[PDB]
Design a protein around this ligand. Structure first.
Ligand code: BTN
Ligand code: BTN
Ligand code: BTN
Ligand code: BTN
Ligand code: BTN
Ligand code: BTN
Lengths: 118, 119, 118, 119, 119, 118
């Protein structure tokens, strides 16, 4: 447990980051399920791009999937430290007109370990 | 326009959903499957899809390995868009198999889901 | 000899799968030469996408290259076992209207080993 | 057309420039940052950008590691195109950090640069 | 339209063929080469092409390594589409070379092949 | 020091190749800064694609970035030998009409090593 290729992280509001691939250049690829009260784009998967560099991570999701659109983007900035990813996020809405319309917060993502099945 | 687009979602009768994110010019298909089918591994979490669109023809395959749950298998669907529906035959192979007889068969019919473009 | 990145497999009807790349996520990339009596899209290369997971493999080719089109897609499902990939395939034709128009069969791909030259 | 295009370059007030090479259909953004900001590591060499465009919304993040100079950090900008300008808030995390308080904040306003299509 | 397209095939006078699968918006070229040139390694099997289109300008390079046969070399062509033809100069480098004098030169002229869109 | 993923090479005319990624198939990805007297498309980054195979390398840049266009492509062919990449390059201009309009030359790229900072 650093920040692995094929890891799953769940924040305090129930949402989950599926990192499926971190290539050698540090480039990240995954998808996000939002379960956060009061927000759109819940319960379906959206694509994640970002970067990893040691314990440092950025990732950003576009809120336009096949089932639902919220005309917005989020970008987390954060770090892996003692079994958690602690992040600060910023959310722009399309058509915004000042940095005052940008919404801010903090998510602490705790891991979930890989079950085997069938 | 109608048919198999980028940014289209399709739910089968077992309640599972194919999220098509992207179709290249190439034909290349990329997306997520969420499995919600009674009796199976790997439900309620999303898994990567690769495949191919060609008018109404479509293949797409899912690797059952994400970071919350793995099922040591791959499914490949093969099908066509016909009447506001995608009609597929699927085959499912389990890691370690030694006989084609161990490859499992089914049929899924995917109907378009409700795009709710609002916050 | 598992199912390798950079391997070449030739079925009973003479056709050949060139797997050039299997990334760590298991995602497969290659190209197919069809030599199967009675079929279109013979003797030129078509692109392959698929997945590998242990000895389990899917791959699918679109039958539209630069020289020739057959308005169809094939998808194999199969497994590596004692120096062979044994597969069942299904072929849709664009504009199909029932699952009865879908053609089925079995290919056993045997390997070929890498010659050095110049 | 105007707005956030493929093949558009944007210089902030510290004199740094975002080179946008490609926006997919997807929304996906790919490009280069050259940092020219007084006081920082990793100036005058280009670094990879990933991110996202959505009308006037835009995120983009830079990994400060190319082969001439590395700074053991990532920056993520978040912003919008408004009046022939992209207005961003950035956050910067250093490898090894243990407190959100160590994440650093700023604001960049990027104005379009001069495209000189000639040899 | 005519010129260097996606989904275009081009055979040179030695009988070899460039299969262009995809040109991005970017300019990026992706495809297969089959070498059919008397006297060489690596014939009759397909090899990956990367490169670049820019109106009538075009580079494209082939790595001579697929799973049936490898030749420990790379070829890079450089050329232009002019009169229903692509006219190229190629350079070929062998792994292990120590002198530019060991880089080999030729000229290929590729004429469009016959697209037979039927089953 | 072979030809690495994450290496930087600077030729005799001051230009620099940033190789950020060489995948296992040998496929190369990077970007070029031109500092060569008498040429367009100086001082900004252009995208590189190519191939590596032992000490053999090809790479090609399209001269169309966000800030400046020169309606041209270059392709180097060359090899790594005793801490240098020695190359021969060929430059086509869009709309060229004979192989006589194609410009030729030789670049010897010497390495630069990775500084740490902040
Ligand atoms: O409502 C929207 O515009 C799209 C969904 C936003 C969800 C936000 S992103 C930051 C925070 N973290 C979550 O897990 N959900 C919310
Ligand atoms: O190996 C497993 O059990 C997990 C994947 C199985 C889900 C199958 S795939 C075909 C069928 N159609 C669905 O919607 N789900 C099941
Ligand atoms: O005729 C077509 O529609 C396109 C070519 C189909 C070739 C099929 S795919 C399954 C089988 N395996 C081969 O090697 N060739 C045939
Ligand atoms: O870690 C470092 O010092 C190197 C990168 C810092 C450059 C920063 S990122 C945000 C700010 N805006 C710029 O244009 N450059 C600085
Ligand atoms: O190293 C080898 O011998 C295999 C590749 C050589 C094929 C060359 S590349 C340039 C020339 N043009 C062709 O059509 N084929 C040859
Ligand atoms: O002027 C142009 O058409 C675009 C820039 C060309 C620069 C050439 S490419 C070969 C040579 N090597 C360099 O470093 N610069 C020149």
């Amino acid at each position: 447990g650093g920040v692995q290729a094929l890891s799953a992280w769940t924040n305090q509001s129930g949402s989950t980051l599926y990192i499926q691939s971190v290539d050698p250049s540090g480039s990240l690829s995954g998808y996000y399920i939002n379960r956060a009260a009061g927000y759109g784009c819940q319960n379906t998967p959206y694509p994640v791009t970002g970067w990893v560099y040691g314990t440092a991570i950025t990732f950003t999701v576009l809120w336009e999937n096949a089932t639902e659109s919220c005309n917005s983007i989020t970008a987390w900035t954060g770090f892996y430290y003692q079994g958690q990813i602690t992040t600060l996020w910023q959310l722009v809405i399309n058509g915004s007109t000042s940095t005052g319309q940008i919404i801010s917060g903090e998510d602490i993502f705790k891991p979930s370990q890989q079950k085997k099945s069938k």
